[PDB]
Structure 1
Amino acid sequence: HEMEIQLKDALEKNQQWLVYDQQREVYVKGLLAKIFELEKKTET
């Protein structure tokens, strides 16, 4: 059944977004941590 197949491909990509999303969120948090450190600097 062809609808059965593309349901699996939809769910596959859906899993690839998910892991990609985890990586991106770590990256966003890293930039925010860097900004925090920079704003802390000066300041003083």
Structure 2
Amino acid sequence: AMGSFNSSINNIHEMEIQLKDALEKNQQWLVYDQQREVYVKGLLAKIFELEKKT
């Protein structure tokens, strides 16, 4: 139908929105995880000093 055609066009609008939002989120996971790695490397260096005291 011509109504099913019109509806199917609107999803394709949502799809773009979904791509855009998911794209900027995997992109934010990078910054977040890069920061956690700073913390982890800190803890590891800290554990390594507590092991010299053993």
- Give the TM-score band, short-chain normalised: 0.7 to 0.9
Q: Which has the larger radius of gyration?
A: 2
Consecutive unaligned residues of structure 2, counting only runs of 5 or more, are: 1-12
CA RMSD in angstroms, aligned pairs only: 1.2
- CA deviations on 1:1-44 (whole Å, 9 max, x unpaired) are 11011101001111111100000011111000001011112xx6
Per the normalisation by structure 2, the TM-score is 0.70
- Residue 22 of structure 2 is matched in structure 1 by 10
5+ residue gaps, structure 1, are none
Q: Extract structure 1 runs of 4+ deviating beyond 3 A.
A: none
Q: TM-score w.r.t. structure 1 length? A: 0.83
Distance 2:18 2:26 in 1: 12
Question: Aligned residues: percent identity?
Answer: 100
